[PDB]
Amino acid sequence: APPAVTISASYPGADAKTVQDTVTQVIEQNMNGIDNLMYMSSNSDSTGTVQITLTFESGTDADIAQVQVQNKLQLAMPLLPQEVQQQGVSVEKSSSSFLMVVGVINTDGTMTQEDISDYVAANMKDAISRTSGVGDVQLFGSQYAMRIWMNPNELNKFQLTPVDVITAIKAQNAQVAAGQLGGTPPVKGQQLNASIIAQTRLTSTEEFGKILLKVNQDGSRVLLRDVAKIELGGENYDIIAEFNGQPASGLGIKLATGANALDTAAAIRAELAKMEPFFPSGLKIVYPYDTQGVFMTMVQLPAGATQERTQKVLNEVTHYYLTKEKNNVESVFAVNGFGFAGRGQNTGIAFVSLKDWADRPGEENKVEAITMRATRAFSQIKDAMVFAFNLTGFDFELIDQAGLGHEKLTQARNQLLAEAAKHPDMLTSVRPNGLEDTPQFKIDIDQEKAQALGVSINDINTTLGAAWGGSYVNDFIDRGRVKKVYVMSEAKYRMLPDDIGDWYVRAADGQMVPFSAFSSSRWEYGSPRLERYNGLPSMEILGQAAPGKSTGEAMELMEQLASKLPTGVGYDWTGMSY
Amino acid sequence: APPAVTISASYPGADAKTVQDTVTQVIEQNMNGIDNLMYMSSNSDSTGTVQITLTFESGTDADIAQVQVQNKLQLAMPLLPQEVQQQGVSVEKSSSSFLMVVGVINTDGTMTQEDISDYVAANMKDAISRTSGVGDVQLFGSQYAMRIWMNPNELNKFQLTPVDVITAIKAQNAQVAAGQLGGTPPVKGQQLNASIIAQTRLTSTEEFGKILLKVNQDGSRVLLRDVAKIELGGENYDIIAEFNGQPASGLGIKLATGANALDTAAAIRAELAKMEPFFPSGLKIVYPYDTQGVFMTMVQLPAGATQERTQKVLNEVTHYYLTKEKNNVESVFAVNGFGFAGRGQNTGIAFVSLKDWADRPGEENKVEAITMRATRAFSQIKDAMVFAFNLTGFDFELIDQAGLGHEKLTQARNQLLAEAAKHPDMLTSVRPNGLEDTPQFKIDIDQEKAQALGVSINDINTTLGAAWGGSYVNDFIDRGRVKKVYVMSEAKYRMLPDDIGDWYVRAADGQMVPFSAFSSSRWEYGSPRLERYNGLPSMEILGQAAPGKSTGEAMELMEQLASKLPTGVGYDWTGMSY
Amino acid sequence: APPAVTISASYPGADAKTVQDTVTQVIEQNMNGIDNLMYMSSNSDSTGTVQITLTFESGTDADIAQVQVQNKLQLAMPLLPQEVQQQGVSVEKSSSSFLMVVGVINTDGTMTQEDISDYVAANMKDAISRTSGVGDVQLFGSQYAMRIWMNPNELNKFQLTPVDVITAIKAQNAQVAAGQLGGTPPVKGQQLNASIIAQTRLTSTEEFGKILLKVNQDGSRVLLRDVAKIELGGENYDIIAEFNGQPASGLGIKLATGANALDTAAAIRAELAKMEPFFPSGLKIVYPYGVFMTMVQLPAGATQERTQKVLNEVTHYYLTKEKNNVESVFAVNGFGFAGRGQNTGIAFVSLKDWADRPGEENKVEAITMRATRAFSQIKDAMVFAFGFDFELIDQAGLGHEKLTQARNQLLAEAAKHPDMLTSVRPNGLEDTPQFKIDIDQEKAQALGVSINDINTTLGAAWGGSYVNDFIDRGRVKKVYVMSEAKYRMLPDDIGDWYVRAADGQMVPFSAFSSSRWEYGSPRLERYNGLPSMEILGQAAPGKSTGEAMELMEQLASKLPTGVGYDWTGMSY
Amino acid sequence: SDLGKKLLEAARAGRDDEVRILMANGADVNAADVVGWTPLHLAAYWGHLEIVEVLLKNGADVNAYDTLGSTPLHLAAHFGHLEIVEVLLKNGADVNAKDDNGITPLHLAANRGHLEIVEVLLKYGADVNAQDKFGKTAFDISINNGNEDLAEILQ
Ligand SMILES: C[C@H]1COc2c(N3CCN(C)CC3)c(F)cc3c(=O)c(C(=O)O)cn1c23
């Protein structure tokens, strides 16, 4: 196991290339002068997420490795966009596998999936994250935020725009340093000394609805609730969890590099015991995964597959264990939106815990046989890569070494994949590891029409970005905890391309201008996940050697096939082939 | 002893809750990925200060712990407010006690307490800071800052607000990068190369005084000295010191964890010798605390106590050693505004130095007996904790486990104290370690009236904050050294509630609007210091066992009455109870 | 050899005092709580560059020091100006050695040093930094930067200022997050989910040239190329590297502690041998450093061009009269030691194998003696081919002007004892003429001209401004806005730069500013946090060093009040 | 001139014996550097009185001005070199010389509070009503600087 350090940033509402060229490349260009560095890979997906992974030689002091990487990241922190820094860039040194999974359900059905997710993040996640030996904690859900769901019809009715909503929230949901009376240095002999308390951060949906946006000239008030629905809601709605079909949430805990698995797992149970007596009624802790006893089932769909389509594949997987393998399976913890290879709408993962070793006599009831039948049952699922494993091949990287561009690296990958198909004697199931380009909406802002109308570019980009992608504004206090405040359009008005024309921006002269008046759009394709290897654009390709022939022969054939690709395309071996 | 790391941040003019809800919680929520962390505690005070103390397991490398905490906070820096960042945060490994104290007095009397403090900061602190094994340097005083003491009556006469003052100071106290003439790339045949010098930072009150704020319609000009008094003064006026009852400043020297005690000390003494030849006339270095021979005297008053009352307790303590133990006490270095625990307008400390051991003969004159007699003499000072000690109960933390709030946690704390008072056969001196709530001045900005008059909220919050709390604008050069510029109201106009209405803010139509038009105020009770333990709101409770019973029974009892506390109130042991 | 740590920062377009009082001091004030620190010294110079060097006790872990130093610096990053944070503040162990210096030229003469440097940055530097056993790598130049060379005459013609050009670039060279169609949470049953793509980074000079600055009230449009010249250039032009008279770039490669030198040297040459098939036509790799150097330093105020003519005469001398011995002459215009600038330079000479250098006249000593004697008669330029360390401290806030007078008092007294002291001289630079311009606030406010508009107009045009990033052939690179050289050379060019007031009228710089000549330092030194001036020297023949040091201590004991001293370097 | 450059650097550094040999060797008394500063300029700027005297005896232009219109009397009045201001005025320096900003030596002395120099300048006929390019006299400088001692000298 080679020690690895991972950098993870987030950019809400950002596409893969926007994330790549404002966050990923900036961080990568400063990742030199780091000792015992073997290679470095990164993913920038349309989730608004970047995950740079830095792998080191065996024996490298993971503590020191983290400091060096973190220390080089500081060179790029001021260069990153403000919206990225506000999410909190993280560097962590952990294994990529899960040590265990802590599940949380509500036996009384008193709490929705969202409610359970927020309680775990607000009352449970931090104490587990600070526990020694815990490298990374993945929440299966998202902490609540103050969600402002804007209505563009009502916003246009009062000559308002998401910019005005954002400005009002920063002004009225503020924490003010107001000073004192009788503060030092005082007039000699002062007796009264009291702190001055001015605006405090709002704490409820009722308070956020009270936020005064404007006073009409006739005297009536237009509040935030008059142009928006205000509710507690998750920071994002991309990770849902189920335990035996019932609503649940949990934390995926990976072990820190070099820590003890038994001692850290025991320290986590001790910390969970400190919070159980103060749970709300109905809440309960369950342990669906503990590291034979267990295995996982990875579900990966094509790019562009929604959370709806992924839930049905997960439903078939959970149905298989609950019906056909019910004599051996105790629980199934299904997670939609989070997967083995990361996080995305088109991925999923099922944690399966078998019943006791004693009540599964016979070899066909053992872990390999159960996973063996499971994958065979999942063989014929359409448009889905569904396999189960307990936990030969090669790891191939196709690099754009002459700045050819993403589209030409795709063709160079297809030409290599086609030539690998004509050699079944040597190469078996050569396929890419990433995602395929999907349709995307390309909108063009006419600078001349914007300037001719008096509509500023910042007003345009803020309106479009906040309504259609969501904008993190500031913080608020929810039951004594600091949480985020997000501003976004109500789902109703950000679903179809015609909804773009329903969004208005106020010009300098005061007239509302519809988004259709200064923009144009067309369909095009673009990557939902851009890969990079050692700083340059890459496309990971994986396969295994044919029956009986060693890996060095398959690698030698792959090297020969790859040298016939167009000029500027190179290659390198990573992971298990390094 | 378990190594501990403390984080220090400050927010000028901010109250306890503002500080906690904007700085403390944000830092605490990012203290994950830290190895070998036992527990975490924090304080957020009405001085505008946070101190988060992270205690690590025994045998932990304090260097690694500090590095890991330093790097985590670096990532959380963009999540903190600009005002806290401009103050600079500190992460320090060190013990709680001082290694030595370097006092500085002025025999000539040409330098007051304020000037002595500025000299030690501007000419001694930084060099002592870089010395071998000195972890924490505490200045008993404040470095000078360019103090702008605004007058609200003059500002209203020229239709100006503190926003205009802060804007003009940033514009006319600037260090401008202006490039070069004949710089690269140059036209060929160029024979001249010279740096362009635009505006340089100001160096004197005279320069700040002629900062042009605005020119009137009749040609007359309004300078900064026409609306304010321009003087040199401390960044803060919180801490002042005295050596044998005469004006003094000094440096509190803490040993960095793991450093040698003596060889450090000699290095401080070595660097001090390099400074003495260039002292002004009258300045002299005295050594009031050198670690038998010395002891300390703690003075703690309840919250809501001013420096005047604290100074009264200090004089009584100083007068005791200088009169009734003059045969034994060589000198007394007393500080007000700084106690052993931390900072506070209600706290103080006195470093007592004895005469040579040989000159005090017998058991009656050694540090043990002298501290016993002193504590006995100070025990009847009313409304003050005064103890004397050189260099065994329990340490209890009451935890808010279910988002109850500060007020509900206070009632639960009082409930546990009342029940512990009914067992004098078991626990005695059951007391909270923190502070009680004090009257504070809640002021509400009416948003509707502010918008009807056309008065910006940020103009209102800046006018209120900068005047009554102070505002760090930018830096200037005082005798070749970078120092701060502070904007604040003159004492006169920020002492009692009626003065709130004396402050005017300019509306969009140029009209001056008094604070009384859009505000309303009331007295209420809030906390001057908010405690947290392991990320959750907490209240430290101290105590000990009754005569002739082991703390185990004592501890066991405390656990039992904590069980009868209201729903959502937890508990935890810390300190030497852990 | 005592370990050391170097903090390097950059403030583009800043004068020496500007960098010291906004960067150097703030960092020095935060160097507290660092273990095993012997002393600290720093430079702040003409070019907006500071290098704070903290040297540590012998036996101190250089890695622990580097981490301890950078942690305290990073926590002080919010206290430095935004322009300094953008350029990056590096903290690298000054464990100097340079395993080898690799040069890159092109035989066809079809590439500028800017063109070559960009290739090395994009195609070589990273793959070299990844080869077995290499440490830090410094490139002789920079990658491409989108250079906007403004013209104030056309800018004034359309009532535009550099502020408008910077505003336009940030608006029209932006990578904006725009969200999704049918994104979570959706209306249940939604089928369409596509990412919204709005503005992307510009990628070419053509796309920057079509940035819309404004449209007149008649139909005409004015674009960025209408008021500026666009080109792919370098980020700064303070260095001009040459190899045998040809434009050059390359890498300086240091070895990572614990690795082997013969190993890594062969691993680098093998990694370079693989790249040659991928080189454009004519790109060759040289190894410019049986070697020696030649220093070039012109009077104060000399230009980069005048330093080049002297460096060309030096390169010519070695390639002509020493053609039997000299193999290569790598000339660096703008870099020397004790100070970088337009009036300084250095030349690195590589000679043929000693096995083919028969005769004592062909040994390096006889080559430098001959070179130094021929360079003796170079008009208005010092050119040499090829003790104790004293620091005079400002101990009572006296100032630079008085600390110079105290230095001259010690230097004069030291010349009174040539029997014990010889070659007592300052190591730093002398005060040079500088162009002080005074903004009149009353006239600016009377005319309605914003102070920020003034200081940005002046600074961006005359010093350059790093606006934002762009994508050049798939790589993130910088965008710089600056005046075309023709309009930022001489004081009369100031009157050509116009700022726009609130009422819309263009106000020239001459209307609200005054200018004078004065003297200031192009390189301010500091020792242990206080202003300093380094003084070198040596004992006279027949005298021990400690004999000379005590006389210096005696002479320093009579300097004006508030002036102290310390021993550093090899005298510590 | 090669000698003129050695004279400028010697006058800049206050080397009176090197300046004397350069004068006897025929160096240009009025050699100017790139900014337009003569040896009298730098000796007046750096307060080298006898270098100012030796230069004037050998025919130095007392009223030479640089590329921005500043005379040696300007620099001497600006930097508190009282004795040099007197010998310049005695050798016929223009007391009312203006630079390109219309700024007179009286303005420079008033700006820095060189009161002794202000009296010597007005004794030699300095126009106290002299305005610069912004219309500010030496009296306006005293009011803006808050220098009351100067404000009563000018009355
Ligand atoms: C920063 C300095 C470091 O020293 C340099 C060299 N060395 C001289 C011989 N040894 C002392 C080894 C180091 C060198 F050969 C070339 C260059 C060079 O081209 C260069 C540049 O910016 O273009 C800058 N530098 C160089």
PDB file of N, CA and C in Angstrom, chain A residues 520-548:
ATOM      1  N   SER A 520     -27.579  34.069 -26.202  1.00  0.00           N
ATOM      2  CA  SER A 520     -27.944  33.048 -27.173  1.00  0.00           C
ATOM      3  C   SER A 520     -27.383  31.719 -26.691  1.00  0.00           C
ATOM      4  N   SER A 521     -27.956  30.627 -27.191  1.00  0.00           N
ATOM      5  CA  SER A 521     -27.582  29.317 -26.683  1.00  0.00           C
ATOM      6  C   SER A 521     -27.617  28.280 -27.795  1.00  0.00           C
ATOM      7  N   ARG A 522     -26.841  27.218 -27.592  1.00  0.00           N
ATOM      8  CA  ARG A 522     -26.782  26.089 -28.506  1.00  0.00           C
ATOM      9  C   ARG A 522     -26.337  24.862 -27.724  1.00  0.00           C
ATOM     10  N   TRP A 523     -26.661  23.689 -28.258  1.00  0.00           N
ATOM     11  CA  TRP A 523     -26.245  22.438 -27.645  1.00  0.00           C
ATOM     12  C   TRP A 523     -24.855  22.047 -28.130  1.00  0.00           C
ATOM     13  N   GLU A 524     -24.084  21.443 -27.230  1.00  0.00           N
ATOM     14  CA  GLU A 524     -22.758  20.940 -27.557  1.00  0.00           C
ATOM     15  C   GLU A 524     -22.391  19.876 -26.533  1.00  0.00           C
ATOM     16  N   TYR A 525     -21.295  19.175 -26.803  1.00  0.00           N
ATOM     17  CA  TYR A 525     -20.816  18.121 -25.925  1.00  0.00           C
ATOM     18  C   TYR A 525     -19.574  18.585 -25.174  1.00  0.00           C
ATOM     19  N   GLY A 526     -19.388  18.025 -23.982  1.00  0.00           N
ATOM     20  CA  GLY A 526     -18.267  18.370 -23.131  1.00  0.00           C
ATOM     21  C   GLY A 526     -18.085  17.370 -22.010  1.00  0.00           C
ATOM     22  N   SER A 527     -16.869  17.257 -21.498  1.00  0.00           N
ATOM     23  CA  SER A 527     -16.563  16.203 -20.539  1.00  0.00           C
ATOM     24  C   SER A 527     -17.206  16.498 -19.189  1.00  0.00           C
ATOM     25  N   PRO A 528     -17.901  15.532 -18.584  1.00  0.00           N
ATOM     26  CA  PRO A 528     -18.364  15.697 -17.203  1.00  0.00           C
ATOM     27  C   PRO A 528     -17.325  15.317 -16.162  1.00  0.00           C
ATOM     28  N   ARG A 529     -16.148  14.860 -16.588  1.00  0.00           N
ATOM     29  CA  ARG A 529     -15.055  14.554 -15.668  1.00  0.00           C
ATOM     30  C   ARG A 529     -13.762  14.587 -16.470  1.00  0.00           C
ATOM     31  N   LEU A 530     -12.906  15.561 -16.178  1.00  0.00           N
ATOM     32  CA  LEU A 530     -11.637  15.724 -16.873  1.00  0.00           C
ATOM     33  C   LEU A 530     -10.512  15.170 -16.013  1.00  0.00           C
ATOM     34  N   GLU A 531      -9.725  14.268 -16.586  1.00  0.00           N
ATOM     35  CA  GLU A 531      -8.630  13.624 -15.879  1.00  0.00           C
ATOM     36  C   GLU A 531      -7.301  14.271 -16.248  1.00  0.00           C
ATOM     37  N   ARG A 532      -6.378  14.263 -15.289  1.00  0.00           N
ATOM     38  CA  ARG A 532      -5.031  14.774 -15.488  1.00  0.00           C
ATOM     39  C   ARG A 532      -4.050  13.863 -14.767  1.00  0.00           C
ATOM     40  N   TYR A 533      -2.914  13.597 -15.408  1.00  0.00           N
ATOM     41  CA  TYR A 533      -1.870  12.753 -14.841  1.00  0.00           C
ATOM     42  C   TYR A 533      -0.548  13.500 -14.914  1.00  0.00           C
ATOM     43  N   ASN A 534       0.058  13.744 -13.750  1.00  0.00           N
ATOM     44  CA  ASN A 534       1.326  14.466 -13.652  1.00  0.00           C
ATOM     45  C   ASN A 534       1.238  15.834 -14.327  1.00  0.00           C
ATOM     46  N   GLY A 535       0.103  16.508 -14.134  1.00  0.00           N
ATOM     47  CA  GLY A 535      -0.093  17.858 -14.610  1.00  0.00           C
ATOM     48  C   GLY A 535      -0.735  17.983 -15.976  1.00  0.00           C
ATOM     49  N   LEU A 536      -0.643  16.950 -16.818  1.00  0.00           N
ATOM     50  CA  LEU A 536      -1.138  17.054 -18.182  1.00  0.00           C
ATOM     51  C   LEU A 536      -2.453  16.299 -18.345  1.00  0.00           C
ATOM     52  N   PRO A 537      -3.293  16.701 -19.302  1.00  0.00           N
ATOM     53  CA  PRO A 537      -4.572  16.005 -19.499  1.00  0.00           C
ATOM     54  C   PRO A 537      -4.354  14.534 -19.814  1.00  0.00           C
ATOM     55  N   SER A 538      -5.187  13.685 -19.215  1.00  0.00           N
ATOM     56  CA  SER A 538      -5.011  12.246 -19.326  1.00  0.00           C
ATOM     57  C   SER A 538      -6.362  11.558 -19.448  1.00  0.00           C
ATOM     58  N   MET A 539      -6.308  10.279 -19.816  1.00  0.00           N
ATOM     59  CA  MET A 539      -7.488   9.421 -19.894  1.00  0.00           C
ATOM     60  C   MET A 539      -7.073   8.027 -19.448  1.00  0.00           C
ATOM     61  N   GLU A 540      -7.570   7.600 -18.291  1.00  0.00           N
ATOM     62  CA  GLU A 540      -7.153   6.328 -17.718  1.00  0.00           C
ATOM     63  C   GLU A 540      -7.785   5.165 -18.475  1.00  0.00           C
ATOM     64  N   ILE A 541      -6.966   4.165 -18.796  1.00  0.00           N
ATOM     65  CA  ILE A 541      -7.394   2.973 -19.517  1.00  0.00           C
ATOM     66  C   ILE A 541      -6.947   1.757 -18.718  1.00  0.00           C
ATOM     67  N   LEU A 542      -7.850   0.793 -18.542  1.00  0.00           N
ATOM     68  CA  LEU A 542      -7.571  -0.386 -17.735  1.00  0.00           C
ATOM     69  C   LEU A 542      -7.933  -1.657 -18.488  1.00  0.00           C
ATOM     70  N   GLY A 543      -7.132  -2.692 -18.270  1.00  0.00           N
ATOM     71  CA  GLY A 543      -7.387  -4.017 -18.803  1.00  0.00           C
ATOM     72  C   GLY A 543      -6.500  -5.003 -18.080  1.00  0.00           C
ATOM     73  N   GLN A 544      -6.664  -6.278 -18.421  1.00  0.00           N
ATOM     74  CA  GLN A 544      -5.874  -7.332 -17.804  1.00  0.00           C
ATOM     75  C   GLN A 544      -5.332  -8.273 -18.869  1.00  0.00           C
ATOM     76  N   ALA A 545      -4.313  -9.035 -18.480  1.00  0.00           N
ATOM     77  CA  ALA A 545      -3.640  -9.927 -19.411  1.00  0.00           C
ATOM     78  C   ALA A 545      -4.512 -11.134 -19.737  1.00  0.00           C
ATOM     79  N   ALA A 546      -4.270 -11.709 -20.912  1.00  0.00           N
ATOM     80  CA  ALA A 546      -5.019 -12.867 -21.358  1.00  0.00           C
ATOM     81  C   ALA A 546      -4.671 -14.088 -20.509  1.00  0.00           C
ATOM     82  N   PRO A 547      -5.533 -15.107 -20.506  1.00  0.00           N
ATOM     83  CA  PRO A 547      -5.260 -16.306 -19.696  1.00  0.00           C
ATOM     84  C   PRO A 547      -3.937 -16.957 -20.070  1.00  0.00           C
ATOM     85  N   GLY A 548      -2.998 -16.943 -19.124  1.00  0.00           N
ATOM     86  CA  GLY A 548      -1.734 -17.626 -19.264  1.00  0.00           C
ATOM     87  C   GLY A 548      -0.548 -16.736 -19.571  1.00  0.00           C
TER      88      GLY A 548
END
